[PDB]
């Protein structure tokens, strides 16, 4: 019980505790750390006590008593050997040195005062004294010991544990002649400790009226026996009681699995500056805030954690980014703000310290042009002039590798300087004499230039991966990777060098710990705290800009954020991204939609609900087809179609804002169906099923009161119908090959549709006539989706991996615009604005369906020049008030489906269903239909051993299922008498043919039956038939009280499930599945 | 020729002319220059990935990935644009296959066969050297082959490797 | 190189004739050069406690050359002209 945390974070690999149960103290080892770690046993105050010549830490043990106050450890790496210090570290010695190679654990007797230690290679435990000037082997020689690991002591037995037998063992601790075995198959035994108060001796405690501050240690120094110690990153002072906290600078170092805190005094090898941070993946860079203490770091996927240089506080902060994983960081200190830096979204970002409500946005983007971000790879700032310096790798696309400026709300960009950088490393500036410094790996340099783009040098030679950088003072570190080597010089002329640690695998970027204090730095957003709603960025001269989080815009009072209203949504297998019209705004106009499951593939908007519809699809999981909404904000997610998609999966989504309608286009492997659900509700409707044809893409206009779709399969065309599919038109069926792309523009009646098997771009008129070519060329190799807003059209390119804008009209030949650059597996784009989707009457030419769905019960159609609304049933039949529904009163077929009872019409061209699809307990096996009370008697299976019979009411108004027989066997065939009034069923576990009375009053038993399936009846000639699949599968005859019974068929009979009888023929009819044929005979 | 090559695709030579034409991906450009190291200029603009390049005539034939084009141009000024095939995935580099004849461009290895035991290769002015087969150096006489007898064996894990110390 | 031992060995060229010279398991003799114009046989040990080693041609006679400010000799070379 009460399981609660001593150490959340500094530890990588503790190899050995040992707690001091006098000094109130805990003490361990680290592999990793190379380090003998003490701290109070809370874990509140932890401080370095042994890391000179350490290297494989393993064992630890400690004697407190007055007057031994002695602690002993185990090192493995070379010159292997076991010493001996007082537990203040303040002297040291070693005590085997000698027949030794791999000690792994030690263990303390206290009577005697020995220490215990065991060896892996040599395969011995022996005991020696303190000194180690007495040595003796308890097991030596011999094959028991294979890896031991750990040792404990009680009484005159030692017990340990070995690794390679995974066995927990115990002997004599003097001469090993009785051994046992305690565990047997533990999976792989580390740790033993023994448990009793004889192994922790009382003494006295001389730190008990100590004032050490922080710690007091235990020493095996006379007089007092004690000496105060600090924790790391403070001082000691003189009065030997207090510690100070040092305000010097320090160094902070990053590599793939650690972060470490080293002193800008060379001569001080210690690592121990601050806490380390001992579980990071993928380091790269590190910021820090000294206003609160805090270290940050960045962690996969989009995260961003921050730790206390104590250790006190760890914790994962904001989310950065549902596009990808962060890789540079940035702090402004003035402000509160942390800039960062994604690559793979190919974005520049802000995020906000201050409140406690997070708030993000992107400040730069690839648009296309040579100044956004092409690969930014290293971010840095300066707040009081208000610039942000960022370094680029450039893109094919046309961004060139780069150190490029900017203002520090995104509103300006320059590029400082280009060219000889074809592998460049992070961008560090001095603030004090406004010098930017960067690395290029390609040719092993350090160059430096000013601000302003002017006197570029080389500064350090010679380097191999200079990785990291920083400047301070007078001095600049840095870096390198493959000389494993971290080195300081002088930043005037590089002509000094110091060598600060070397050997360090896996090496990154460096940054310096220092008080930078905002008073000086202030800026615009210091002076003018709480303008801003959201987030305060400076620029230069002292001036102050807001900003607004993504999916949010700022209004014209310059300080209120309202959501955006106008943007365009686009697309692409990984993601949903918004994006804005005016091209100098690189914001995300909605939060972005990604992560697990997302396959999208065609997504619509709603844009007087505020909603868009995507659907996604997956050839290898069921769960992730279908069509889902979100909001922009990311607020509400639902799923609004998921039972029954093809394989193909669903290929079309069409939102009809008037009615309140979605259309889709379902793809099985043969055929396609067009269907239609009213949101919000559970009513769902097939329109169109057709085998030859293949709709793919779906449109919808609800002001011309037309449904235009484009099929991309064998005979490939356009076509155009009513919003009930009633009606069926061809607008293009020649010079079109993969029609891929359909939009529809209200202000002209054109569709326009984008072909890549021909690479053209076209329109034509809704009413037919000829067809007019836009753009077509080599160029646009693969136009993918199209959309039409005011004199544009905005299409995107898979191959160019571009979003790209032209105008709309015929024989223009300016060269398109571009949007955004270097995004892939694009799909189709849509708008999102009120001028698309207007809602007034006279604007809708007055559409029947605009108010409360025109009256209709389950779904309203307006169809063109027609003044009045036309309803549809998702289930049933629609009645004389023309807008009501009821449940069909003509011939229909009915059929078990799992746990459901579902209906069907003959007319295979019908997609009513007769009535709505009804829910049973357990799956139903059985049906007949009482056409007395209007009822449908089936048979359910609720286990592999138990059966159930039930009845439903249809015309009774809402009905529930009714049970009779709660239990009987697995029962699967079922008729019903009409003459009599009674009712048959085959039971099969039971292997049994049964009547019951219609009431479940009377029950008999008519004939035993080896596998008995199907039940026939005829009442008027008195004659009962049934099927059986047993050995010697046959078909028999009886008489309805069972009284004779003959074999009807006895031949060429293995599994015959189904039997039926027809009167107006006077003809009986089976089915049998092994030999997979229907028969009928006389 | 060195500077904006970030990604650099095939060179070719016209030999008439004596010029170099190469592709730069990351600029999408067609360059041409002089084999001396002067008169850089760009001939075609506004590629996308060209991936390869040819040039017979009076034109310049190139092939292009991602607008999935093979095309024609003028190699005075690129002026004027044939395409040749479109909507081709996965393209790679071209050749012209013509009547290149021995006789006109005749060098010194032609004109001293069998000079050499092992390999003959030209060098400029009409003269020709001679070579000789991995694990093998020449000897004084210029012609003859002798295996090599002073080298540094060096060991990587895939393979063993023999240097001259001769740089 | 065993596990939890070493052998240094010696072969004739061209002839099934192998004797083994040495077996150690505390010593790690991994790298391995010969002199026959002094007739010394030299070898280098990375393990813990790591040192350079001289010996005779059939490891008769065992010497230690280096034994301090050595943690990870790996690779070892001989001159005849300077000894
Ligand atoms: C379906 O239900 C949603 C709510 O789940 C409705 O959305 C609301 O629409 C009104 C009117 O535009 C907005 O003021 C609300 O903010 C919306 N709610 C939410 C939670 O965003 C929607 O109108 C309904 N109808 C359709 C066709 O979606
Ligand atoms: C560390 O080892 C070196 C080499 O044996 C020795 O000179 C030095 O005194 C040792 N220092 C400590 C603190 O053990
Ligand atoms: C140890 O083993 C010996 C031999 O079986 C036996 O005589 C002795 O009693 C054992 N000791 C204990 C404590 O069981
Ligand atoms: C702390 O001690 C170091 C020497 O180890 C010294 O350089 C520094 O100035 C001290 N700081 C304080 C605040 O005492
Ligand atoms: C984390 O920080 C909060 C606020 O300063 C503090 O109350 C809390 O104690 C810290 N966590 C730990 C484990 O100390
Ligand atoms: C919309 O999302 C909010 C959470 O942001 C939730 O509280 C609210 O209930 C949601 N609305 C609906 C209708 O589900
Ligand atoms: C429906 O289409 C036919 C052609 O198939 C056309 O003649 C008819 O006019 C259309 N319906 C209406 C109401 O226009
Ligand atoms: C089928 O019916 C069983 C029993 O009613 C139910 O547990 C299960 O979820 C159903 N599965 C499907 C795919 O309908
Ligand atoms: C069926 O159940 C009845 C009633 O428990 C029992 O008498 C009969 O023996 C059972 N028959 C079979 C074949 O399980
Ligand atoms: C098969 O059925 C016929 C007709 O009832 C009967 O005459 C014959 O004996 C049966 N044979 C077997 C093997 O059951
Ligand atoms: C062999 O080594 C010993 C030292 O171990 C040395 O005294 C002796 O001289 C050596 N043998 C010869 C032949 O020199
Ligand atoms: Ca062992
Ligand atoms: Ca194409």
């Not at 791999?102 to 060896?119: A, K, Q, T, V």
């Not at 200190?333 to 974005?347: C, D, E």
């Not at 150190?403 to 590029?415: E, P, V």
């Given at each position: 019980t009460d399981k609660r945390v001593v150490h959340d974070s500094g530890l990588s690999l503790t190899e050995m505790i040992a707690v001091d149960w006098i000094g109130r103290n805990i003490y361990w080892t680290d592999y990793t750390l190379e380090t003998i770690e003490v701290s109070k046993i809370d874990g509140s105050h932890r401080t370095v006590l042994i890391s000179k010549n350490v290297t494989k830490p393993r064992g630890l043990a400690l004697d407190p008593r007055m007057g031994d106050n002695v602690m002993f450890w185990s090192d493995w790496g070379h010159?292997?050997?076991?010493?001996?210090?007082?537990?203040?570290?303040?002297?040291?010695?070693?005590?085997?040195?000698?027949?030794?190679?791999?000690?792994?654990?030690?263990?303390?007797?206290?009577?005697?005062?020995?220490?215990?230690?065991?060896?892996?290679?040599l395969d011995y435990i022996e005991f020696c004294d303190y000194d180690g000037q007495n040595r003796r082997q308890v097991i030596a020689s011999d094959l028991v010991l294979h890896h031991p690991h750990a040792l404990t002591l009680f009484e005159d037995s030692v017990f340990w544990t070995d690794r390679g037998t995974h066995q927990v063992m115990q002997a004599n601790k003097w001469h090993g002649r009785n051994q046992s075995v305690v565990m047997y198959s533990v999976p792989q035994p580390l740790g033993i400790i023994a448990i009793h108060?004889?192994?922790?001796?009382?003494?006295?405690?001389?730190?008990?009226?100590?004032?050490?501050?922080?710690?007091?240690?235990?020493?095996?120094?006379?007089?007092?026996?004690?000496?105060?110690?600090?924790?790391?990153?403070?001082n000691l002072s003189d009065d030997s009681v207090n510690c100070v906290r040092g305000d010097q600078p320090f160094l902070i170092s990053v590599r793939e699995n650690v972060i470490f805190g080293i002193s800008l005094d060379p001569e001080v090898k210690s690592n121990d500056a601050m806490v380390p941070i001992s579980g990071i993946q993928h380091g790269y860079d590190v910021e820090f805030d000294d206003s609160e203490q805090f270290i940050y770091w960045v962690e996969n996927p989009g995260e961003i954690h921050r730790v206390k240089t104590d250790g006190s506080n760890r914790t994962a902060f904001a989310p950065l980014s549902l596009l990808g994983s962060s890789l540079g960081l940035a702090?402004?200190?003035?402000?509160?703000?942390?800039?960062?830096?994604?690559?793979?979204?190919?974005?520049?970002e802000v995020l906000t310290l201050r409140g406690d409500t997070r708030y993000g946005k992107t400040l730069i983007?690839?648009?296309?042009?040579?100044?956004?971000?092409?690969?930014?790879?290293?971010?840095?700032?300066?707040?009081?002039?208000?610039?942000?310096?960022?370094?680029?790798?450039?893109?094919?696309?046309?961004?060139?590798?780069?150190?490029?400026?900017?203002?520090?709300?995104?509103?300006?960009?320059?590029?400082?300087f280009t060219g000889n950088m074809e592998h460049l490393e992070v961008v560090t500036l001095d603030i004090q004499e406004q010098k930017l410094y960067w690395a290029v790996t390609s040719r092993g340099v350090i160059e430096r230039g000013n601000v302003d783009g002017t006197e570029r040098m080389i500064l350090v030679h010679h380097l191999a991966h200079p990785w990291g950088l920083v400047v301070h003072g007078s001095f600049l570190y840095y870096s390198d990777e493959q000389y494993e080597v971290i080195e300081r010089v002088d930043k005037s002329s590089g002509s000094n060098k110091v060598v600060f640690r070397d050997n360090i695998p896996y090496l990154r970027g460096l940054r310096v710990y220092h008080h930078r204090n905002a008073a000086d730095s202030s800026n615009g957003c210091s002076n003018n705290p709480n303008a801003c709603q959201q987030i305060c960025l400076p620029v230069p001269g002292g001036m102050f800009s807001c900003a607004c989080a993504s999916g949010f815009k700022l209004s014209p009072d310059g300080r209120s954020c309202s959501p955006y209203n106008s943007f365009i949504v686009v697309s692409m297998?990984?993601?949903?991204?918004?994006?804005?019209?005016?091209?100098?705004?690189?914001?995300?106009?909605?939060?972005?939609?990604?992560?697990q499951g997302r396959n999208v593939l065609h997504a619509d908007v709603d844009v007087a609900n505020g909603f868009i519809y995507w659907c996604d699809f997956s050839s290898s999981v069921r769960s992730s087809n279908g069509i889902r909404r979100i909001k922009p904000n990311g607020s509400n997610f639902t799923n609004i179609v998921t039972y029954g998609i093809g394989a193909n999966g669903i290929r079309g989504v069409a939102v009809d804002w008037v009615a309140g309608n979605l259309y889709f286009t379902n793809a099985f492997v043969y055929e396609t169906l067009i269907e239609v659900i009213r949101i919000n509700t559970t009513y769902r409707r097939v329109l169109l099923k057709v085998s030859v044809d293949m709709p793919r893409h779906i449109v919808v206009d609800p002001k011309h009161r037309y449904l235009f779709w484009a099929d991309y399969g064998q005979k490939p065309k356009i076509e155009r119908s009513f919003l009930d599919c009633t009606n069926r038109t061809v607008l293009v069926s020649e010079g079109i090959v993969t029609p891929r792309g359909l939009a529809v523009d209200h202000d002209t009646g054109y569709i326009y549709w984008v072909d890549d098997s021909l690479d053209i771009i076209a329109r034509i008129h809704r009413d037919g006539g000829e067809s007019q070519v836009v753009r077509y060329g080599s160029?646009?190799?693969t136009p993918y989706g199209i959309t039409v807003f005011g004199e544009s059209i905005i299409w995107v390119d898979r191959n160019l991996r571009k979003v790209f804008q032209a105008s709309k009209q015929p024989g223009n030949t300016d060269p398109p615009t571009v949007i955004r650059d270097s995004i892939n597996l694009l799909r189709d784009v849509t708008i999102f604005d009120e001028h698309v989707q207007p809602l007034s009457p006279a604007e809708l030419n007055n559409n029947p369906c605009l108010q409360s769905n025109g009256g209709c019960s389950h779904f309203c159609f307006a169809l063109p020049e027609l003044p009045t609304p036309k309803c549809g049933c998702a289930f049933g039949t629609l009645e004389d008030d023309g807008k009501n529904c009821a449940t069909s009163r003509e011939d229909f077929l009915i059929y078990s489906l799992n746990n459901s009872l579902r209906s069907l019409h003959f007319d295979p061209q019908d997609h009513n269903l007769p009535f709505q699809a009804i829910s049973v307990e357990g799956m139903a096996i059985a049906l007949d239909y009482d056409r007395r009370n209007n009822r449908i008697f089936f048979t359910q299976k609720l286990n592999p051993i138990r059966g159930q019979i039930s009845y439903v009411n249809l015309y009774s108004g809402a009905s529930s299922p009714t049970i009779l027989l709660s239990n009987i066997g697995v029962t699967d065939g079922i008729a019903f008498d009409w003459i009599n009034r009674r009712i048959y069923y085959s039971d099969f576990s039971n292997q049994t043919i049964n009547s019951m009375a219609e009431d479940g009053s009377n029950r008999a038993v008519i004939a035993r039956v080896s596998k008995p399936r199907a039940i026939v009846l005829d009442p008027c000639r008195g004659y009962m038939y049934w099927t059986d699949w047993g050995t010697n599968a046959k078909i028999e005859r009886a008489t309805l009280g069972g009284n004779f019974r003959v074999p009807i068929v006895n031949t060429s009979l293995v599994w015959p499930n189904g039997l039926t009888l027809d009167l107006e023929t006077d003809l009986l009819y089976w089915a049998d599945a092994s030999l997979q044929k229907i028969e009928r005979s006389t």
């Open positions: 010159h292997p050997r076991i010493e001996r210090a007082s537990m203040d570290g303040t002297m040291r010695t070693v005590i085997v040195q000698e027949k030794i190679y791999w000690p792994c654990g030690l263990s303390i007797d206290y009577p005697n005062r020995l220490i215990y230690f065991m060896d892996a290679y108060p004889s192994r922790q001796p009382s003494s006295p405690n001389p730190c008990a009226s100590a004032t050490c501050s922080h710690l007091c240690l235990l020493s095996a120094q006379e007089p007092r026996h004690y000496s105060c110690a600090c924790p790391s990153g403070w702090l402004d200190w003035v402000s509160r703000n942390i800039y960062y830096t994604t690559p793979a979204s190919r974005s520049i983007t690839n648009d296309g042009t040579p100044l956004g971000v092409g690969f930014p790879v290293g971010i840095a700032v300066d707040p009081a002039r208000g610039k942000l310096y960022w370094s680029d790798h450039g893109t094919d696309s046309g961004v060139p590798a780069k150190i490029a400026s900017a203002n520090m709300d995104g509103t300006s960009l320059k590029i400082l297998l990984p993601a949903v991204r918004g994006f804005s019209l005016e091209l100098s705004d690189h914001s995300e106009a909605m939060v972005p939609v990604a992560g160029r646009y190799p």
